[PDB]
Amino acid sequence: PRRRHTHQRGYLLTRNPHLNKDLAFTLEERQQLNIHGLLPPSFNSQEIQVLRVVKNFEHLNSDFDRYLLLMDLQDRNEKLFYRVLTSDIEKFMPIVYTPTVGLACQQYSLVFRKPRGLFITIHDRGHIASVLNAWPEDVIKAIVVTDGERILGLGDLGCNGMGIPVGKLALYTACGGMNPQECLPVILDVGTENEELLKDPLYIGLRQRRVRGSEYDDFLDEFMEAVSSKYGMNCLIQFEDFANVNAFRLLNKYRNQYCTFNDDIQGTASVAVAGLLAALRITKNKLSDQTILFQGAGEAALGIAHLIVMALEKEGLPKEKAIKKIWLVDSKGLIVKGRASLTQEKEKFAHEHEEMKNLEAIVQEIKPTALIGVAAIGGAFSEQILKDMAAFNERPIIFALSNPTSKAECSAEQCYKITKGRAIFASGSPFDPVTLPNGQTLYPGQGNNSYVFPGVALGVVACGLRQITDNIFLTTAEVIAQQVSDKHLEEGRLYPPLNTIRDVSLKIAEKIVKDAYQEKTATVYPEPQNKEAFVRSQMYSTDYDQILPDCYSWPEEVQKIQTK
Amino acid sequence: PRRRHTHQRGYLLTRNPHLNKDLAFTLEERQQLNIHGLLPPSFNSQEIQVLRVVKNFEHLNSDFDRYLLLMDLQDRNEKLFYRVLTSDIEKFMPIVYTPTVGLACQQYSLVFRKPRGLFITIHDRGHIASVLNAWPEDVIKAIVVTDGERILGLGDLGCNGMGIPVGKLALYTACGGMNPQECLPVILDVGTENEELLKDPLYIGLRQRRVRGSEYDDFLDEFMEAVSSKYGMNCLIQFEDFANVNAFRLLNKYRNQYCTFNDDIQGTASVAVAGLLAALRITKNKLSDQTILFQGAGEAALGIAHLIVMALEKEGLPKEKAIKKIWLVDSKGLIVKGRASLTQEKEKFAHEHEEMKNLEAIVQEIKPTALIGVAAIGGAFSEQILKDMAAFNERPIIFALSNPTSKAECSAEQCYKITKGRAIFASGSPFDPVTLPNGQTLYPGQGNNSYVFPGVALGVVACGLRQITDNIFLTTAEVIAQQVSDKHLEEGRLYPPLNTIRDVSLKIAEKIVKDAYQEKTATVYPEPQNKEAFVRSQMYSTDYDQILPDCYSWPEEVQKIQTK
Amino acid sequence: PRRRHTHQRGYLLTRNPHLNKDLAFTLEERQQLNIHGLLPPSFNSQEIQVLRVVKNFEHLNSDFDRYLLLMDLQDRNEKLFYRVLTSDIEKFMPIVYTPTVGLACQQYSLVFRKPRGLFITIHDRGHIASVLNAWPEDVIKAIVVTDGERILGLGDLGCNGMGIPVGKLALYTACGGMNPQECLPVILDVGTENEELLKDPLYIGLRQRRVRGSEYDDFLDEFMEAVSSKYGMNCLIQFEDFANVNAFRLLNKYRNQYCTFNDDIQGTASVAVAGLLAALRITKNKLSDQTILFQGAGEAALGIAHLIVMALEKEGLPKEKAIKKIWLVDSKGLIVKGRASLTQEKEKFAHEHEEMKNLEAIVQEIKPTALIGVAAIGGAFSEQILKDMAAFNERPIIFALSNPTSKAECSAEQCYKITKGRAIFASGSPFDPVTLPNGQTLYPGQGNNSYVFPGVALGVVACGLRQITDNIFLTTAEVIAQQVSDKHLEEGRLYPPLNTIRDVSLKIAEKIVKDAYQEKTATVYPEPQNKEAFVRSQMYSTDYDQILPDCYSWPEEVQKIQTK
Ligand SMILES: NC(=O)C1=CN([C@@H]2O[C@H](COP(=O)(O)OP(=O)(O)OC[C@H]3O[C@@H](n4cnc5c(N)ncnc54)[C@H](OP(=O)(O)O)[C@@H]3O)[C@@H](O)[C@H]2O)C=CC1
Ligand SMILES: NC(=O)C1=CN([C@@H]2O[C@H](COP(=O)(O)OP(=O)(O)OC[C@H]3O[C@@H](n4cnc5c(N)ncnc54)[C@H](OP(=O)(O)O)[C@@H]3O)[C@@H](O)[C@H]2O)C=CC1
Ligand SMILES: NC(=O)C1=CN([C@@H]2O[C@H](COP(=O)(O)OP(=O)(O)OC[C@H]3O[C@@H](n4cnc5c(N)ncnc54)[C@H](OP(=O)(O)O)[C@@H]3O)[C@@H](O)[C@H]2O)C=CC1
Ligand SMILES: CCCc1nc2c(C)ccn(Cc3ccc4nc(-c5ccccc5-c5nnn[nH]5)sc4c3)c-2n1
Ligand SMILES: CCCc1nc2c(C)ccn(Cc3ccc4nc(-c5ccccc5-c5nnn[nH]5)sc4c3)c-2n1
Ligand SMILES: CCCc1nc2c(C)ccn(Cc3ccc4nc(-c5ccccc5-c5nnn[nH]5)sc4c3)c-2n1
Ligand SMILES: [Mn+2]
Ligand SMILES: [Mn+2]
Ligand SMILES: [Mn+2]
């Protein structure tokens, strides 16, 4: 076990969730820590503590009640919290993170009990350094920050968006083995445009409209200098759930000077491309053979498209040819050269072509090999679309990435039925196994951002990468695809099973670290002989640290009290 | 507003439920206490915090879940918790104490989250002093202690008994203004006979049978010494939920040397007598004039009868006259001279008489003016009993004290119906108002122990009474009955409204204090001018304290930084 | 030994002079306290520690430097400091207190290093309570307070007077076994009249003239309130080195409400009367037989005289007759009826007699059997006066109480020479033993206040006396006199030896405690069986406490970590 000799003693030690073991404290520990008597007189193994929590967990009636229970656990005993989470990652992920964390953010102001994370507001402009000073952990290696302007599919929840950094960093630890004590969740509160919350007597945020323009920009600037100043330039800064206009803009602004990335853009890209790469092992052809059609042309679609182009360039195809293989549809229709209401980023994919408004006709005209839904329009992949995709393609790739199930472009059932079982399918939300007439059962997987971010962070932090290139995300996509077995593919899965996420994260971190030492981008020296064991050594374990003083004798002659 | 200049700062301050205000911390408070940023950017008044708690409380689906919410609150923000309680004492008391705390204790080992109170076990024999060292508050004035052998009406729940001292002390504070910071809930774990808990892998207590005999006696001896030695002879020690045999033995053992009482014995006698005294103002005669028949002859019965005799003596009746006014019935029947299976204590009321077993006949024979049910046999005041009571008496006094209502000697509805509205009625457990055919509504009250202990503690402590005589309990009964208005009595109520209990507690303490100075038994000096103001000044307020450093300038001449 | 279980650990523990043992911490203590490595790797017994300190002490070149060394010691290791002191009380007393402390106070502003004691200024008026909150010890039982207006014979030293309360409390502990952690030295800074300090750039106090009048009076009132309110009414409050009018005035004002005394007045009275009482065992006659002449009629003379009168009334003489036995001489000369410049307090001894201004003739006129010098006029007991005293008395009682040596009414040498060895002599400042012409040596002792205050404080606090009557001082004088052996009296010693002082203090306290239970004035209950052992148990030892957690096992069955 890890040794960490605490100077804390008495009641206040029990109040630190990194020190507190509850009933797992032995008699010897309790007496030595001066807490003997503050706990009932029984001694639990971690397995006994897990049993208690699960029994409670099962007696609860909603996902929300389940979330509240686990969050109470997080704030009492960090190690037990992660022991529970990792005892069944597939069960607990959807409780502490999406989709449930969604309801928690809607209900954040109502249920606000024990705070988690650092709140920095626009009125602390010029004073961010001293806001940081309140955080009780000096050594921080990963930050997740939101301004709450675009939480999941729920829009502007302002300060209620604190649930996202908190639950995200939970997964950083549970999935990727980041040390939670080195993790810092942040919300930047500049106001909200959410009208209910402005009216709500219980709202915990700044009761004002969002501050915009160059004052916003200068506040974000200060946030970046203060954090990197205090925690070092190797501290990872991950943005989440910013508005569309800020997300790309800020990533572009900072990415070259700070150790930062944005999961809504780059993580989404990685995991989508990972699913494509896996699907290629079914179609048995190259990426350069594909024609990609995106329904949607937002953060998801443009991030994904950017990374596909990069994979195509890696395969040898020049950029301006790569781009021609990708078509976009937005709310105004197909993106083509000279259309009204194009942006500069949309314009890169504006190929010469007749304007088209209707998706079914777009499909019939473009005849994609791969059709990616990222528009949040439920049912968009209609019978005709699916019929057409199966007409044009042996094994049509169809990704219904919109979340949750209700917004999904089609179900697994509809996809497999209408394509007579030939579609290669993945989705944003889980769908049950589907059994086809011929008696095969298909297990369509989910392109979960959780395959990507935990291992990327671990990797980056472990070797001290100073910038996170888009190449890290391409390389990661390859690693993920690599973990899918032929048997998985023939089962219809494009992703490794969820329960292996801890292993996926390790392999992702391993590859990043090997690469950084290879190409001299690593900053942590001396270079480790064994990259595998080096990364493992940097992972947080759910086993309790020993915290007692190191006790040991000296030889009799020199240990004894001198008198005469 | 009260002061409290803490040295605590930063994260650990927020972990102290005595310092922590959560959102009620002003911006100046947060910045000054080095916690600015650990909380979301809104500043809430205490009422706004109350609304948040109450909205939460409301959406819960059981009293148990409501208990868990309030207990979580207690352990995060002690003032807010007490503000919640006192905002509707009649609504909250059944949730934090009886009957909900009963389920809490049953379930304590399953739902155990953060500890409250001090656990002292048989195996700490010889070390109790050092166990006391773990308690983080040095200044303790009130202790509630249990061995969990006889929790409410649920029997032996061993270490799970800890719910009782915690809930009991919450009522000390909420109902009587005892400072929670100065209160110590204690469980002595000597084992349990509870077979279910002994089998239960989750049980938090010692997994062994109860230690008996001298080993136990020596342990309690050391308990009393350690506690009074550390907290001083002025510190109140209240026994609760001991086995009846022990309860009486231990009170007898310690009452003359320590500041100790037993609420199951003495508080019960006090509140029953209080009801009787109130009833005398409807019957419009003397306690002297009554013939009392007790259904039951156990801890409740013998305690109440003892105090009745003392009230009779005080009226001017000699003991041996007093005594003949009280008859008891046990499981074997009427207590009569020379009957079998009698004890020394039941002997005091063994009058010369034919043995009888049937309560209806006993009733027809004794013809009491007052029938007091304390047998825990539901339905024992039958139709015939009620009929006879109302034929023998204009206004028959009928107390159905057995708890909960399902064990009550009769319901209020039956009592009022069969006595044709003539019975003066009180119960142990709440009954609904009853409306007579003449359109008058009667509101039978409850002889809630909560009318007695909060005020008695406040009194004993405020004036430094070294011992708690039985006369304290006679006095307290008189004070309670005196708070009942003629209007209340006309409404069938024998007790002051539960929502006034703060006031009732103050008046009880006023009287104890006034008495103590008068007959020179107080130990706090100098003697206060105005005894109401003095007691008032000893009571804990739910208002937040100010804990900011005291800041004030000096004249500039002597404040200047000297130079040369 | 004694146990004090601290939650302190690591560096800061070593900064607490009550926890810090330096090299006397064992290896196991160091490891357990998280300080192993902060000390060099040798383990010293207390005696080795004492040897180091004493070696340094003897290499220094002045008493002043010795003072600075021991004061540095007091501020790093309290137990070792007091071990050193007590190892040779006669040697160390004059270093930490008079006369060396006088130089310390004159130099206090220059040599100021680490603070000791609490500074409270007139500018803190209204805020005294909050000043008290800075003191890190909540349990306070003895306070010594000065305004620094009359320090020793060095007049007004303002804030530089802090040396007096500090040094005085050291003697409380060293001499009387008061717990130093329970003692609080205070200076009240209302300004100074000292022109050299007012002019000095380094002066540490308020650079202003003294606030007089009701502003002063109101300040002192708040002080008594705040201190009694925070520490309780049993907290001892000893006034020291106030101006003369203030001292009496303040003593009269508060003595009836507060547990307070003034050592300059009452301590002085007690020790001088102890000396007288001792001398009566040489002259083998009664106090009522004496004719007493005071050279001086200030604080010392009037307090001694008042206590003599009390002792005379105790022997059986009405006050009006006892008064006749005492003659005062002031700077205007013999005090008599009608005289100009008489305060109403001198009026108490203004007998019918003609004015006289020459001491020599006052002597030859009064023919006193005892002559007491408290006028601060060096050499006033001239050869002629001494010749007369020996002519008029077989054994003249002669007290040269003025301080220091240079202000003595006569030296031991001169007194013994001129009275040809028959004078019964004691002084305020120490003289060497004197070898007479017959070759016998006499050992005049010192009427040192140290004989009185440590034992008074011990007794008062031990039994919880709420006021300190003058009778305490009379009883105390008797006790000290009883400690002088006949053999000592034959050597010319009026006082028990300085190296037995702790025993004398024990005896003084025993008597106070016996008397207080005897006449029901004690407030600590229950009454101890054995008053001797009770006072002993209250005395601070110079032995180190054990501070390690109390560790002890439970039977293996219950101590076992529980699994499934
Ligand atoms: N790993 C995963 O499962 C992930 C899934 N997603 C899913 O992708 C979806 C979109 O996310 P994101 O890109 O961040 O959102 P954005 O809001 O950035 O983009 C939404 C895009 O949809 C376009 N659009 C809206 N209506 C239509 C329509 N009727 N037909 C065609 N296009 C339309 C918008 O058009 P315009 O440009 O005209 O406004 C915009 O281009 C969500 O459902 C989300 O759940 C996202 C990230 C990850
Ligand atoms: N403030 C309140 O409202 C309070 C109410 N109570 C209630 O009073 C009831 C008794 O509690 P407590 O005195 O502590 O309990 P005990 O067990 O000490 O006393 C019970 C008594 O009932 C007797 N009894 C049992 N069966 C019968 C029967 N068929 N006929 C007559 N007597 C019978 C027992 O007889 P034997 O001695 O032969 O066994 C015993 O004397 C409980 O229901 C409790 O809820 C108690 C305290 C306070
Ligand atoms: N235990 C001990 O050893 C103690 C010794 N002392 C010593 O006693 C001395 C006086 O102390 P204290 O009473 O506090 O001082 P005060 O200043 O209160 O008293 C001084 C007294 O001496 C008088 N005086 C001054 N000059 C003469 C003179 N020429 N002839 C006669 N009387 C004169 C003053 O007279 P007037 O009233 O006219 O001003 C005044 O009455 C100091 O030297 C002090 O060291 C004091 C306390 C304890
Ligand atoms: C791992 C691959 C990630 C990646 N690296 C990239 C580089 C270097 C360059 C370009 N992209 C594409 C990209 C990625 C995301 C994105 N969201 C946008 C957006 C979305 C909605 C609304 C407005 C805007 C908006 N419009 N204009 N500004 N903001 S536009 C946009 C472009 C990249 N993607
Ligand atoms: C406010 C007045 C309270 C009060 N002061 C009292 C004094 C001084 C003396 C006597 N009583 C009566 C009293 C009070 C309670 C009690 N429980 C008992 C008991 C209960 C159950 C089972 C066995 C026993 C049992 N049987 N024999 N021993 N234990 S017996 C018993 C007597 C008093 N009540
Ligand atoms: C153990 C005996 C204690 C004791 N109890 C006493 C009681 C109750 C009453 C009187 N004395 C005598 C006493 C004791 C000290 C003292 N200093 C004074 C003083 C000295 C110098 C200058 C002005 C004043 C001054 N003049 N007027 N006010 N201040 S006058 C004075 C009287 C007492 N001594
Ligand atoms: Mn997101
Ligand atoms: Mn009870
Ligand atoms: Mn002095």
Curated annotation (Swiss-Prot), chains A, B, C:
Keywords: Acetylation, Cytoplasm, Metal-binding, NADP, Oxidoreductase, Phosphoprotein. The active site is at Y97 (proton donor), K168 (proton acceptor). The modification Phosphoserine is found at S331. It catalyses: (S)-malate + NADP(+) = pyruvate + CO2 + NADPH; oxaloacetate + H(+) = pyruvate + CO2. One of its GO terms (biological process) is NADP metabolic process. Optimum pH is 7.8-8.1. Belongs to the malic enzymes family. A divalent metal cation binds at E240, D241, D264. InterPro entries: Aminoacid_DH-like_N_sf (IPR046346), Malic_enzyme_CS (IPR015884), Malic_N_dom (IPR012301), Malic_N_dom_sf (IPR037062), Malic_NAD-bd (IPR012302), Malic_OxRdtase (IPR001891), NAD(P)-bd_dom_sf (IPR036291). One of its GO terms (molecular function) is magnesium ion binding. Homotetramer. Catalyzes the oxidative decarboxylation of (S)-malate in the presence of NADP(+) and divalent metal ions, and decarboxylation of oxaloacetate. Its main location: cytoplasm. It is found in: Cytoplasm. NADP(+) binds at residues 150, 264, 296-313, 403. Expressed in all tissues tested including liver, placenta and white adipose tissue. It comes from Homo sapiens (Human). Its cofactor is Mg(2+); Mn(2+). GO terms for cellular component: cytoplasm; cytosol; mitochondrion. The keyword Cytoplasm applies. The gene is ME1. The record marks D264 as: Important for activity. This is NADP-dependent malic enzyme.
